[PDB]
Amino acid sequence: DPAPATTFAHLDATTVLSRAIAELGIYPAVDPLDSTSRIMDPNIVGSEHYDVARGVQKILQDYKSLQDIIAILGMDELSEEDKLTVSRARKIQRFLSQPFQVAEVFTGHLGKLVPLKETIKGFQQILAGEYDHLPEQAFYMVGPIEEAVAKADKLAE
Amino acid sequence: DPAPATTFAHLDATTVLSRAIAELGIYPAVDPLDSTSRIMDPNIVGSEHYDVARGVQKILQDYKSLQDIIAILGMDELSEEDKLTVSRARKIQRFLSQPFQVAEVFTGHLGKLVPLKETIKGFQQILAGEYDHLPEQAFYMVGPIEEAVAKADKLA
Amino acid sequence: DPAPATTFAHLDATTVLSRAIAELGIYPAVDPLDSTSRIMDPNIVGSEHYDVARGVQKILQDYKSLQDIIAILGMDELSEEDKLTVSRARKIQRFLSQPFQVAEVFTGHLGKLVPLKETIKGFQQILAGEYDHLPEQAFYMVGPIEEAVAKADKLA
Amino acid sequence: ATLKDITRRLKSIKNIQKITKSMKMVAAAKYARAERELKPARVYGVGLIIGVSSDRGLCGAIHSSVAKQMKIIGVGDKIRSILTFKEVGRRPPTFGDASVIALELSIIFNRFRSVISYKTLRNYQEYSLANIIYYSLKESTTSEQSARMTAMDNASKNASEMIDKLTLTFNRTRQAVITKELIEIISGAAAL
Amino acid sequence: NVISITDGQIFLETELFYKGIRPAINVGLSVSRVGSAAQTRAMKQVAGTMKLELAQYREVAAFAQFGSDLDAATQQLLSRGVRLT
């Protein structure tokens, strides 16, 4: 749309929200593959923040590009590494969600604020395979990565 | 289109005919899922008529949602429960076709008029699984369910 | 699109230059199945011109069918009928190439301008099998069929 | 009915078409080796429920066709899950595989007609038992890899037709968006 | 307009960008009509081989995550291809 399209060039950082994402219960409904920042540079945020950020986006793009194919040919036709990034990407999609203090009337969850180092570490860890044994849902709608381990135990029964 | 879209609000019943359905030889080419009636209410038509109608529409909608997979992969990749709704749905579709007196030149069949009770019974029986053994084509271009059964026996 | 659609109403032929063909080294890189003519009609050109062209087409189309059965079973599991059409088709593909006079500088080969009756004759005979004893690369970058003989001797 | 949609649908189906075509040919090569290997295994074959299928799906009604004639050993991953050995169908069945199966101990399997068709002392007994396990097994992958080749042929052709039809829809929508957008501009300009 | 006016185009894509192909150049679509005439002999040499090997890669690139029993010749195309990429 001319209006939003013309606004992009006036910005240093953009957060793009998506109805397709909100529809899933992923809130905040941010598109991880359409939000950008002028300071997303290894010389500014450091190579560790940057390499994790880029790794998260890669695994989501790869999943995005698999979605529709396996939705027809089945999950079984995937190699044991193609389906590894499927499980991991789905955890990461869930770990990007987060209950907002200001959204308690909607989530029924207490709001969480997550420090940068913990955000980075959390995603670093899922990317590295550290939680392949936890279930997808444990990553849905929590703050720090410890809350997802907590949640996994709570789910066990 | 503005013309038809504006007309919908003026009607108590709408019969929406579909080219897609026509081209499959279903006549009359009524879209079972796009045609509605303000008196389709259990307090007006009674609960048996209402329930059979809603059951037909459910199976047809269920079938419609399976049709993406059918188009690419075909019947073989379906579960046994889904193969059943497909085969009942396809029977229902054909049972909704009907020879019209006015269209005898085009069908090559004599025209039929079906009493409402025989209409309810026929579809009620198909839904209940009473004719899973009969082939699809037996339900095409008949009046009452009895004709599709006779037609089934004739197909030897 | 209106622009191409309006243009096509005026076209009597298409010449389709193809990158696939170019990378296979066939000059000129004309797609022999994709290019068409409106006057490719026995009532307009020869009844002999028409059947040679139709025969060339069918064999080139038939060669394409067999190309899946080659990278699977190898070019030996084919029947004697099917081996024959591969050998003839490939000689036809190469026989459709031509050294141009206008490209004497860049290449080095001498330019050829083939008369219509000689073009018709050449292809009619590769189809007949009057050159099955000759090697495949005898037909490449020559003019008339008389240079396919001269080039097959110079390779002995 | 959005240019946005159509483009996504088109992207997936072009790749499905490419996959199913490669899978078609993988199976075509496997059916090739399996039909030739079937010769010294059919005449060789002339001299509790056992269900013979495999691990891999996408071969139409191979796995469900024996599972129906089933209703107790299930050779093939797919037979245990729809109703006991893993890692079959993938690599051609050796007489050694047939012995690994019989060591752990009516036979139901798919018998190869064509690429398109298929239908569902105490030292001597052990060799004749393994002679049946092997026979059913060799017959089975011929029938599976034929079927998968065929089914993957069909899916590829079905995807290809859907691609054609969606491209047409794409261009019709594409042209109408241009025209509608222009008519809006004109009507506004004219009304002044 | 600007596509027909120019001698060639470098096409960038979002999807290449997030897959890690940065710079995000669609090498199958991008074109320079000047081409070789604007390359030194040394580049011309290796670039010519790269082009061909990448084209042949593109033909096969969807058998990547769906390829167990591909012939060794095409595992070679896949491998040379991901590496050149």
Side-chain angles (χ1 to χ4, degrees), chain A residues 59-79:
Chain A
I59 200 176
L60 295 175
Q61 186 61 75
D62 294 334
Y63 176 53
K64 192 147 171 215
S65 306
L66 275 167
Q67 262 190 316
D68 310 316
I69 287 161
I70 82 175
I72 282 140
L73 304 176
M75 190 79 179
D76 295 318
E77 282 309 310
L78 287 183
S79 163

Side-chain angles (χ1 to χ4, degrees), chain D residues 28-42:
Chain D
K30 288 191 184 184
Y31 152 83
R33 281 288 274 248
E35 204 210 320
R36 281 144 68 254
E37 207 167 313
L38 200 63
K39 278 208 77 191
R42 275 179 163 185

Side-chain angles (χ1 to χ4, degrees), chain A residues 33 54 57-58 61 69 77-78 82, chain E residues 14-15 17-20 22 65-66:
Chain A
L33 307 171
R54 290 310 192 205
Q57 299 181 314
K58 184 180 187 298
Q61 186 61 75
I69 287 161
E77 282 309 310
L78 287 183
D82 325 337
Chain E
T14 305
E15 254 156 282
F17 189 95
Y18 290 111
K19 265 175 191 176
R22 301 181 287 269
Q65 283 177 292
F66 290 89

